[PDB]
Structure 1
Amino acid sequence: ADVNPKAYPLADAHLTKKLLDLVQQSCNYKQLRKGANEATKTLNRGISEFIVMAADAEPLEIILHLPLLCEDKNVPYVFVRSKQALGRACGVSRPVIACSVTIKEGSQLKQQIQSIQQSIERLLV
């Protein structure tokens, strides 16, 4: 409990494991952009499948621009509880509050990305 209500698409424990596993796979294929500034740039260039954010940023407003940009481009987005967990999945020694998986031609993760995309929109009902 004790989660900011502004992080509405809060994935549960089961979906969190699927998300962080796919993020870790995307790092091995060079298909991930790390950081809120880099995540914003992919949305402007229209090369992102989905956006993962961390719900435990002490001021949550520092990432709330991303949901607005995602709704314009029709890109799914979710929140996870720990920025430490998101940082380790990205392969970085520092906490990460937002990451973006990018569009790759011929990517082997296409079936897994599509299943995760379908899972995210279910949270929006």
Structure 2
Amino acid sequence: DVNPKAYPLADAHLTKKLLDLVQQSCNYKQLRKGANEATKTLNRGISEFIVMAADAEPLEIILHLPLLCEDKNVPYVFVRSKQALGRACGVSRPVIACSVTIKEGSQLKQQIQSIQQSIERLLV
């Protein structure tokens, strides 16, 4: 199965919703790909939420992101596939961490808030 270290793992419905929102954010120029860009967004406090994969090997290369999310008060979730997450980001290469940035006046704000509420009530 999946690594137990990724405890806030989303189910199929939330996985589909998260991938759809990630694709929409990519279309709106509101997404950052890669763990390094996710870390940069977290340090600058311009991240709505962080989506990271559960197939990263080793998973410890992105387990620092939950700590930064807790420090910066940003929701985070784990998806079951690093290949579908990359495809949602618009990149054929697998992506193990994507960050949805904050853009004032964006039409995705309501969907972003709904996804944040869904994620923040799923970790435990």
* Other structure's SS at 2:49 match: strand
- TM-score if structure 2 supplies the norm length? 0.98
* Other structure's SS at 1:39 match: helix
Structure 1 stretches of 5 or more lacking a match?
A: none
Deviations 1:64-116 (A, max 9, x none): 11011000011000000110000000000200000000000110001101100
CA contact (8 A) 2:25 2:100 kept: yes
Deviation of the 1:124 alpha carbon: 2.9
Deviations 1:29-51 (A, max 9, x none): 00000000000000000000000
Structure 2 stretches of 5 or more lacking a match?
A: none
Runs of 4+ in structure 1 deviating by more than 6 angstroms, as ranges, are: none
Deviation of the 1:52 alpha carbon: 0.2
* Other structure's SS at 2:95 match: coil
- TM-score if structure 1 supplies the norm length? 0.97
Aligned identity (percent) is: 100
